[PDB]
From Swiss-Prot, chains A, B:
Residue range from the parent sequence: 35 to 106 of 107
Disulfide bonds listed in the record: C9-C35, C11-C51
Protein name, UniProt field: Growth-regulated alpha protein
Length: 72, 72
C-alpha cells in the first residue's frame, strides 16, 4: 500500500567518483520516459549500485578507470 | 528440469560495435567467479542486452559513443 512517483529511476544522488575496491561494474543509460535523465550506476561488489556525475571530471574518471583494469 | 553450466554469465557473443538507435545503455563488469571474464552488455531500447568486445577498437568506440550524447 503506497504511491509511486513519476520518476522512479535508480541513481542514489550521483556521487563524485567514489573509491572502487567494491565497485565491480557500472551501467550507463540515456533519457527517454518521465525520468528523462541519463543513467550512470556503478554496481558495487556486494551487488549494490550507485550513481555518479559523468559530467563531473573526477566521475568521468570513474568511467575511464572502471574501463581500465584488463589485459591480465 | 535442466542442468546449469558453471559460467552462466550473460554476454551473447560480444559483437563488434553494432549500431545504436535501439542501444539505450550498457553495463561493464569485471571477472570474479567461475565466469572469470569481463562484462560489456549494451542494454537495447526494447530492454534487451548484447555484449561487445571492449578490447576491440570499434567496440571501444561503442563505450565512448554510448558515453557521448549529452549536454542537451
Amino acid at each position: 500500500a503506497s504511491v509511486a512517483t513519476e520518476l522512479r529511476c535508480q541513481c542514489l544522488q550521483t556521487l563524485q567518483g567514489i573509491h572502487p575496491k567494491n565497485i565491480q561494474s557500472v551501467n550507463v543509460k540515456s533519457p527517454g520516459p518521465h525520468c528523462a535523465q541519463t543513467e550512470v550506476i556503478a554496481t558495487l561488489k556486494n551487488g549494490r549500485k550507485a550513481c555518479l556525475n559523468p559530467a563531473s571530471p573526477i566521475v568521468k574518471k570513474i568511467i575511464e578507470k572502471m574501463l581500465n583494469s584488463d589485459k591480465s
